[PDB]
């Protein structure tokens, strides 16, 4: 008897968040994110920022393509509309140094500005590796300890999908090319900094079912922040710590039903006394539409890269598990300068052995189990599927509820509760709000109805959940209180039974 | 995207469905096992009784029972039923097994209190004749449990478990002066925790439908695979050293109902299979199938011609070459002569008078690989009816296919967990009608509305479906042509191959077989250019 999915305890409609304020500057949004008091709107040609303290334009960076590379562009076959600057990287590289890339009109390249007045600092560089040519394209970017931490693909064509670090005074490392085992048409989502990991969330076809057509399985990816690439012999300027694992999100039964298409994963946050990611995962697309909110514990994704290695013994043999008399002393994926790996001041240093089994096996044999082992929410049969998500772990005036905050494709918002009272059970969330946000008067413009959602920055401070669309952003109470008997509601934001 | 599911061209609410005719058992908590129709006879077997229902008598708000079948457990199998822990609501004599084995006898087994047994009782008089026999094997312990059988050229065909506990599931073969066949015990090539859903007589073959774990799926998970697989009619069994008292044909293959992508989507769960209906000059059967229990829930019909299921038989063997590695097709030239399959008398085996007589390399090869590698297509690749976008799963399947005037359209009735009937024609498909045929005041017994559809069985003399709950048997109108009175655009647009405008009444009515009047009606296009609306 699969779950049955609860309505919500409010729903919202077009009637009622039709008056939330909007930011208008087509803009084409890529990206938000909100640093300090000021939110971020990376876009074509711009980022626009707004002080969180109609929606105005407080200033604005500008970087539009030359006209040699726009036709270059052209010259390629490429429409006009996308042979422009699109930013699709921003970080900060730290309190005075903004990172921004752009697809450049499919000639990407990266500059530093500054943080408080937006001109250029330095003059640019390659963005091979480091950005997407193609707006269209999911990518991952992050700094830890200077280095950079990127994922897209190096080529026009799209074909080369790399998982790379350059930048920070260390050497650059790559996933191997056109090794399927490594990278199998990836997707990418997210890459997080923990301990001494980053670890990449992406989805690709697994070669668990190579036999058998294609089916996409959600991943964790490990790589040592101290990786420094191979020897002369194996490996050299890539990867020697890469290992990757299915992520398990299924409602488990005498057969389970999983949840396979990865479409967003948060932030490392604190939940419960544990450290772990929530993550929203689908149906796929030729199937009855389904979406699910699993939550990770990075114990448990650690833990997945300690157990045994994958591998296939024949062409026309299933994937089994290797024997751990056939694992390499010392054992791969560790970070040099730890336990038992000691004597190795760096991975340049590591044997032969070691470093081609991890080439030839970068997958565990293992699944990630979620905690709960079941997912935290469920979302079956509605015609829009699960994407964006953010979290508020302070929530209520006693901030110790776990509000999660989870997007669509088609403009749609939903809000659960995960954790109820003081007792810390996590096997009953509430499904607070299911609302629709999109505002077609002042975001359907210049030809555009698009009401996918590109982003979403929660803002406690402001009390608010900001909204990205390709062509507007929306600023969203965090709670619709206003809407009498308003202790209903069990809304943490609004005396109140929440029993 | 994925298909989603199309609207009814007309709905019909509990509110209006509650005037058809009920059968609840007056002339109790019912239980209802299934319901059959022969000659003019409604026949509902059900706890300790079968009930007999005219089918004629044109009746009123209630339906009557005719005549009486009564047979309750003894008291000591019901006390040992008890004694072995089973609850009390388990331990009564549950009919499960009603054939007619001639023109004058009824064969019936009944789960006896988990104590299988069966009886010959004589049609008029409903009345036992002979001593009781065995049901094991014949008809299962367990009353919540499926089971087939099927008599042909005097054979009872069964598939049930032996035992108690239910482990030793088997498809068997007795009476009609021919051998004792059993399926191999305890070996999971042939079958692995089977749920039994039909039986079939067709060509030289009994053709069996059921679903069981996938073995050559194991990986991930347990995963239930539908099948279909045949039996020779003639199969004597094998000879002392192999096979001696069991089947000699018994070959199984996956049937393939999916949603084709980049991505297949399969609907895995068989729930109910069809007899063998002509269409357009094909022999086919109809399929539902669902989504496991445990997942988003989702219904589809397929179709299946039985050439396609005949020549799935006819290609490569599946094998295992190596505990871990995949399941591979069999080069034919590992395949002995005679062909692993072939009945007895049949092209280049007329040489053998009897599987008894087939070579051991045959019988060994047969007991080695009854799963053929190939999966049985459906009817245009894909589903000619989903539900995908409803909390119930579709499961019962009528069709008619000489439906309407000219006897020449094919409409299909669809069943479900939920007293919830579907309508709609093949020819994509035309969903013609949703109604909610369940009855509360008449169907729920105590606190409990059962909403399931246990059977249904078409009659077209008389235009009815019978739906059977498990506490009731609603007597239901093939259209509800009524309902459009006196406006013809409605009645036309409506395109039910049962419905027509009489002009000589000015009304729409059922279209009947004293057709002495003019019948308009547009099914092929639904043209109702020219007609305002009412
Ligand atoms: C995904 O997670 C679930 C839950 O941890 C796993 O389900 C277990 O699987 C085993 C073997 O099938 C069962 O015997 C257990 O009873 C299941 N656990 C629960 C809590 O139901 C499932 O196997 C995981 N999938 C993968 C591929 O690792
Ligand atoms: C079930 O049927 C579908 C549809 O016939 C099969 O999908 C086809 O498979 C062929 C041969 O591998 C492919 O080249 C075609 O592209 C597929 N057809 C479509 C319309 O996509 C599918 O293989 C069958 N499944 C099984 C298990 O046999
Ligand atoms: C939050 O704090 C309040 C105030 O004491 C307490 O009553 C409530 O149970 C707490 N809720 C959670 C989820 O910790
Ligand atoms: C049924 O028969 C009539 C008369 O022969 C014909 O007009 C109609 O097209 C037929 N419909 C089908 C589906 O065969």
Known sequence: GFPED?????????????????????????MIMIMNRTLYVAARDHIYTVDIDEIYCSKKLTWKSRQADVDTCRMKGKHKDECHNFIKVLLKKNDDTLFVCGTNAFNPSCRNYRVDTLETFGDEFSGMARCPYDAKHANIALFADGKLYSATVTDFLAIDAVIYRSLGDSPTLRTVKHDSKWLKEPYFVQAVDYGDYIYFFFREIAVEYNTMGKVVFPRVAQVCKNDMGGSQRVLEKQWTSFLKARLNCSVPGDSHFYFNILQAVTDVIRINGRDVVLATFSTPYNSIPGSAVCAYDMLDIANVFTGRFKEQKSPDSTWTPVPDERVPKPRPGCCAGSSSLEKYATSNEFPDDTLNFIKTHPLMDEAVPSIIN???????????????????????????????????????????????????????????????????????????????????????????????????????????????????????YCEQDIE
């Open 6 to 30: 609860s309505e919500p305890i409010s729903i919202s409609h077009g009637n009622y968040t039709k008056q939330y304020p909007v930011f208008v500057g087509r803009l084409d949004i890529q």
């Open 374 to 492: 079941r997912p935290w929410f469920l979302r079956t049969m509605v015609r829009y599927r699960l994407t964006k998500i953010a979290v508020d772990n302070a929530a209520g005036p006693y901030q110790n509820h776990t509000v999660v905050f989870l997007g669509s494709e088609k403009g749609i918002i939903l809000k659960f509760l995960a954790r109820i009272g003081s007792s810390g059970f996590l096997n009953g969330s509430l499904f607070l709000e299911e609302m629709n946000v999109y505002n077609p008067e002042k975001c359907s413009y210049d030809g555009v109805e698009d009401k996918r959602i590109m982003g979403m920055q929660l803002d406690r401070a402001s009390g608010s959940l900001y909204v990205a669309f390709s062509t507007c952003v929306i600023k969203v109470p965090l709670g619709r209180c206003e809407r009498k008997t308003c202790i209903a509601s069990r809304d943490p």
